[PDB]
Design a protein around this ligand. Structure first.
Ligand code: FMN
Ligand code: FMN
Ligand code: FMN
Lengths: 184, 184, 184, 184, 184, 184, 184, 184
């Protein structure tokens, strides 16, 4: 029984280090697991109940259904101002309003990449808190906070080059897989 | 010593209860305090370093300047998914990248309104964490979590009518003024 | 498959509302679930590595083993100063140092009873954060924050009397059972 | 303008790295600032309202009075299980019940030391949350999380020798002094 | 005519302030100047003529070659015991024995970061003395001694944040480029 | 009082002229002075605070204790690139980090041998500067700079034969003894 | 037992900060120590061996004798062009040619004052090197480099007013006293 | 394109070996290079800011102008007390205060003569440190330390006779020429 994971990306910039990490996941994916990226969160309008009343934005409904059929979600995001990027939270806000809400019962792993050293622990904390409210099953272990990322992805070639980082992400995907199969 | 406060609104919908509360603040304001609304957070694009490199969106600079010259800020916002609305966080994210950063040293009070009963305590917690990182001085007391907001503003007429709520908010404004004058 | 749950109590006072709730759990327990109380957290000394080196206090080892053999744990606790009571956190600190650590992989539900309206949301938040680190599986839903408890447990008789509350707790226990069996 | 700060220590063990940091603060203190240690939190019994009715434990009243008369408090603590040590929280719980409550309006700085890399960020977050409730004024910047403390204090001799750490802490103490003088 | 500078780092610890400064140089570099880090000095064995007779260690030849193709070298190092760190001096010792010797005629700028007020000036003195022997052309002005570095790079995030320091360094790089072009 | 001197050797090579000088010292030594070599500096790893975090290398602690218990130290070293060899400096860097630091108050004599004519005068200068920081008492006179050392030790037999040098070294050892007894 | 210290001043201008420091020494002097100024270095002619043949200049023989009979010398001097002022070096040059040479075996403490931040570290270094040649015993610790001296002396009123500076110089004088007596 | 060099003499005595070396330079000078002596440093008064305020001494202004107009400077000096003669340093001190300062950007070569074996290496070191501060471009190679000078200049006739030394000095002037033209 092959697993299907989808990735949600929390940064919009082209040279995003988190995007590099996200793009690496399908090549890193251990046997039995296929991984594909979701559409951009940049296509969502700002959440507004008035907009919702008129109808859900198409990219929102598309993403929700993509999450619904997936075996798990991997969220890869930077940390802004000791919390989750507003753009990413905005995507979560829209998704949370869909019926049925696609994150309920969904296995989720969190990954954060940062040039520094804390590696996004606070964004992950806040993100987990929302995901508990949405009844998601967020992987406890191993925690994926990737520090000093600037020297772990190669400039010009966009790709995550750190071999140690790649192996770590593979172990996290395996644990996420185990969680998904346990909950099924 | 006359103070000028500005208000930041965390909801975009026309019938927003938090908008109703924000509009009451300038009439409610104790003497010696004038209060004006900031522009809408809905005019901001999603944060992206690429957009920033090209130049700060005009509404971002306008808001940063109004905050810089104000003596204090009142943030009035709902709670989405046990945290701050993505849209509001996105505005904070944009403001945080301005030089000089307008919230540094700024006295701030938080107000949350909810139809529910917790009344937005969780959004205020996460907001406070971000504001500390941005070196703002956020009012400790009194805390303003307005629950059961449905019966405190009259529908059709948009306005906050509950006299006890008004009197409480005036008193929070007093504490904010006192905090501002202490730090000056 | 009959399940056995144990209860961990976060308040030391005799007239504790949280104690009333904890005592109600074994009679409330649905068919197939038996519930027994752990020893008091008041018998633990303050955590100290110096004390630990000399040897683990007996009640710590006794509690750890009762948790290890249990199918799930229910923590019933008040909220002090927007967080977990120090005494309860102290018990968790001791448990976390036992090998093997008894909360790893353990299903846990959180319950808070309070005179207020927030009903211990902040304590449960902080507690969840610690339990995540300890690799516990904490029930997402339903959340058990019992507000206005003064009229829900009767004075003179010490016991939880509100029938609606009892029925709620039964359903939470049912959800905890389902989580435990899913993870088994 | 001579200031007096008191230090509250969150670890009980003899060889505590945080104790080593706390002992260094008075010699590190910039001109105009004297710093003295509070009594041990290990002398407090577990918080219980039943005990409180009988009377506040003497060491609790002694510490509350030293805090009340101090110009500021520096809390130095490790992080246990992604939060504040139970014993330390227990001390805060006791202090919070004294009248008048000694931390209200008190300038406070936080210091955490850890063998890891995070250096106690999570403990400081939870501590800040409690301190808001108690109306303390906790220093926003600079934040003192001392990671890899093992190579910063020399074993066998108990003392903080790392010159970079000392300079950082002195600058934090300068900022606390400024906060204290501003609020006075 | 685009220039390529390489950086030589004199400290081995991960949380090194000098490394933080070294990492900032390529983003700081004015247009027409690209800056890349050399390999670690930690891979060199201790210098020994006996080892040399057997053959030059690979990382030595690799570094010498990278220096050779570079238009200039920036040496970024702390000061140990009023002088140059032995590990760095050891790398210079190895390089000085390569034929042809890569630093002869090479433009060199020196940068030192330190907690003190001296800012690593003594290390720069001794370093200059060795470089004269190696016939390097070391920039006279501006001299870059970054004192009180603890308040100039952010703890937790590894990054050089002091804006005045960054511009000062950009100015040194301009002066280094000018020196290089004069000799070219 | 049979004084005990220890010798620290700055060259790692088998045929070292400085090693030849160091080995000559105990036979040159007047009655009442025993001279023994310290362990090799080649056994030290490169200094790193990260390595220190995990623990001081055993040979570092051994050398520190032997220096600490010795009545005086004789440092015998070549000069590399107008300064002290990196390997030797690396050993000093490690010793300086030991508590208590073994060179404090320690009588020290410097001996340098070189094929050239300067005879290691520049190395002694830099070494003295470090030794000032480490609070050592280094012998002013007589200064032992052995130039043209190739013709002062006989090939094939490794031994220091130049009668003028031996007599000179003997007088230096006497002065070192006199200094040691004076400081007692 | 009574000590007599003499001060040698390295600056000739009336509003000299070092002159201010020099005048403070006899009142700052701890008990058992009297401090008197030497004559001015400005009365010495430029050194010349031809002039020396005719006879040593009178102020030189006078200074040499005052130093010889003194228990220790305190040299207070600015730093010129990263080194010792030529005038002061000239006075040293003259003293060095006297028989017997007055600085041999003499305890010396160095003090430098500067409006800047380095505070004369480079001058003290060069001075030390010369004094080694002259067999002086120069105090290793504490080092007295007084930076930002402009606010440490009150202008127009001539005298050193910074209390922290006075106490520090007092401590150096104590160490100089201890050094002299050990060597006795 | 003919170059003009000026010579600065560091000894005042009639029979100075360094003077003999200085006088030989114009005859040794290769075609395309003419060399003239500066005025004597003995005509300078001791540096004093009080004197400077009244006006720069005539010889200072004269020497500054000749250095400013020269293509390079050759400094010929003995070494006193392991450093530069005070009188020479005094001339430099005076020059350093003129605007514009004449040594800035000036190519400089150093020549030292001594009867010993070190050959003035220490004076050249210290001289270089000051000249770097004054932004001079000091020749790295070849280095001219004329040791064993007594038999290299003949008494009775005042002249520098050592043919190898003369050739060495000729090569240095060419290197000095090449340096000057590179910087032009
Ligand atoms: C508005 C904003 C807020 C940020 N806040 C933090 C923060 O709190 N902690 C941190 O380590 N980095 C913070 N960063 C830096 C990001 O971690 C860094 O820019 C990262 O590379 C962004 O992720 P990306 O490369 O995938 O776009 C912030 C950046 C921005 C633009
Ligand atoms: C990298 C290196 C740098 C050196 N630098 C100098 C120097 O600056 N001055 C000098 O007189 N000799 C210098 N030497 C020569 C050494 O003094 C010579 O190799 C001596 O024999 C080394 O001491 P040893 O025989 O005990 O190994 C240098 C040698 C090496 C390998
Ligand atoms: C020729 C000259 C060179 C100087 N060089 C330096 C220097 O290298 N570094 C420094 O910090 N100050 C330098 N100074 C400034 C002195 O510190 C200044 O004279 C100071 O006021 C101390 O001298 P005073 O005792 O006369 O006050 C120099 C001043 C002069 C006149």
């Amino acid at each position: 029984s092959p697993l299907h994971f989808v990735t949600l990306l929390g940064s919009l910039r082209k040279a995003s280090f988190n995007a590099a990490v996200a793009r690496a996941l399908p090549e890193i994916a251990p046997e039995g697991i296929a991984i594909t990226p979701l559409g951009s969160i940049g296509t969502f309008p700002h959440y507004s109940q008035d907009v919702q009343e008129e109808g859900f934005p198409a990219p929102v409904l598309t993403m929700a259904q993509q999450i619904a059929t997936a075996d798990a979600v991997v969220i890869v995001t930077p940390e802004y101002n000791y919390s989750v990027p507003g753009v990413l939270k905005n995507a979560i806000d829209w998704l949370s309003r869909v019926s049925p809400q696609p994150l309920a019962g969904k296995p989720v792993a969190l990954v954060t990449a940062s040039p520094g050293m804390i590696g996004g622990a606070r964004a992950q904390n806040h993100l987990r808190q929302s995901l508990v409210f949405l009844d998601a099953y967020v992987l406890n272990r191993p925690e994926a906070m990737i520090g000093q990322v600037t020297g772990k992805v190669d400039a010009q070639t966009l790709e995550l080059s750190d071999v140690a980082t790649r192996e770590f992400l593979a172990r996290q995907l395996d644990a996420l897989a185990a969680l998904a199969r346990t909950l099924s």
